[PDB]
């Protein structure tokens, strides 16, 4: 049991936090609890302020800020700490009480209760040419000296810590995702039925995705090529809402289905970020620093109001795509395709 720490270069302002990772269940989110330690002998009248800031920064906004768009900011909450002005609210925390007793006097606590409707942390995949200060939705706990006319002096000596909210698995496997379709081309009387399924519903990062594909083709038409892929599409809503269609796992099957015949088998595609290094605009889990992290864990919502949640929502759906072959002007020139899509949620399990 050890506790994080982040001190100002001045050295007066230091902030202690129990954990840097906070998980948000559907019912409630774990509180952001911390303390701040100073030497008030140095400042006779300056105050101590601690804030939780959520920001939907960049995300290719700056390409259009010069005329079209702007960079917004999400929920921000403030608390004063130097004076116990309320003196009435003090739920306190076991960790907070223990740590205060450890440090002793001059340690002043703070507690934040995140509203559940806020989204989880996610960072857009930074392009190598951009090499900037990242992008996406971030949360941050940042502390200032306050109670003064000018904000220039304390801005440099203010402290800031990154904290990112994540969601874990709901450990409850649901109904088997199945997509069944029947296609009539209006040229033939014999249809083709495509039924695809996944092995289970919620997958763990790095676990192979197994797809059960069954095709029954009653007409003379065959399939030239079997197209199998999942895209990581994230709804950047309350915005332009340009849900981006970017694949993450690719599978080519040149197998052909004869007329009035069946094709029955299982494919294994695994999604991983090593191959998608060259890609840009991909959503990925919360980033603390330039240190890298894995693909974005799917964000689940409560089926109540289901209001358009502020920020980024990522959901995973894998397509199976049958393309038929038409030979026009001798060979080739086919331009038809029939695809169905299977949704799934990919996220880490809860550590014990």
């Amino acid at each position, epitope marked *: 049991t050890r506790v994080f720490k982040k001190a100002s270069p001045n050295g007066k302002l230091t902030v202690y936090l129990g954990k840097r990772d906070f998980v948000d269940h559907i019912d409630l989110v774990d509180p952001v609890d911390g303390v701040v330690l100073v030497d008030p002998e140095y400042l006779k009248e300056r105050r101590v302020y601690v804030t939780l800031t959520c920001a939907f920064r960049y995300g290719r906004e700056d390409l259009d800020v010069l005329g079209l768009t702007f960079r917004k900011d999400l929920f921000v909450a403030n608390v004063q700490s130097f004076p116990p002005a309320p003196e009435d609210k003090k739920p306190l925390t076991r960790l907070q009480e223990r740590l205060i007793k450890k440090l002793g006097e001059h340690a002043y606590p703070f507690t934040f209760e995140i509203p559940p409707n806020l989204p989880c942390s996610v960072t857009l995949q930074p392009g190598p040419e951009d090499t900037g200060k990242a992008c996406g939705v971030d949360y941050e706990v940042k502390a200032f000296c306050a109670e003064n006319l000018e904000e220039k002096i304390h801005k440099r000596n203010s402290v800031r810590l990154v904290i990112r909210k994540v969601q874990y698995a709901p450990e409850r496997p649901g109904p088997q995702p199945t997509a069944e379709t029947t296609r009539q081309f209006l040229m033939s009387d014999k249809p083709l039925h495509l039924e695809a399924s996944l092995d289970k519903e919620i997958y763990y990062h*790095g676990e192979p995705i197994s797809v059960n594909v069954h095709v029954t083709n009653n007409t003379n038409k065959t399939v030239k090529k079997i197209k199998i892929s999942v895209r990581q599409y994230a709804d950047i809503c309350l915005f332009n809402t340009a849900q981006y269609k970017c694949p993450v796992a690719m599978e080519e099957a040149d197998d052909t289905v004869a007329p009035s015949s069946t094709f029955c088998k299982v494919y294994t595609l695994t999604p*991983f970020l090593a191959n998608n290094r060259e890609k840009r605009g991909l959503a990925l889990d919360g980033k603390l620093k330039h240190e890298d992290t894995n693909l974005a864990s799917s964000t689940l919502l409560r089926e109540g109001a289901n209001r358009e949640i502020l920020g980024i929502i990522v959901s995973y759906k894998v397509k199976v795509k049958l393309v038929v072959s038409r030979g026009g002007l001798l060979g080739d020139l086919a331009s038809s395709d029939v695809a169905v899509e299977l949704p799934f949620t990919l996220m880490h399990p809860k550590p014990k």
Partner: single-chain antibody
Amino acid sequence: SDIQMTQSPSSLSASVGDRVTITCRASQSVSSAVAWYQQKPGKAPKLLIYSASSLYSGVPSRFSGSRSGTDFTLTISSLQPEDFATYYCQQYKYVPVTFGQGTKVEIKVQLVESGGGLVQPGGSLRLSCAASGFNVYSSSIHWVRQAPGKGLEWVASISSYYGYTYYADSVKGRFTISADTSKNTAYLQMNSLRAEDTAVYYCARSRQFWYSGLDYWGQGTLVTVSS
């Protein structure tokens, strides 16, 4: 830099059923990212304590461990005939991973590995361990030495999900590691083996997400060099 980690005592004799402890120190702050390992002689080692506190599932509760600053200690409640072995401790907060010399205590879902034998100076060799029951994108695979009579030394690391491979300092460019994801196998190609690098080589598995030590340990194979 490189973290040098010193374990004490070098060896200890303790009767059966009594308290015993083994200590170790880290040159630079490692921040609870240390693990304690048990090694029966001849057999491959297994994990005891991860995250500097927790006990790996299946280990008896008679084992325990604690930390203080950089001095990290392990406590055994009683000594049974299943206990006497060599105990090791290793740090993983920064690459490279460095183990300790270790302590020899005396009373007084699997993996396969192959590709060992005799080498000549300037020769090459193929070590290969195949994974059964654990995925190649959901687990990182590491290769580690064991020279005869001295503690383990980290050799190489492969992480398929991230696409990065790491090599030990003394062996830059000497060999190459690569994973066949189709067959779920890990290949490691010695090229131009020296005379110093004589050891039995073990490959182990770790969780690619939220590293928690080298849980499933490969049996490994012995290799030697002669002119």
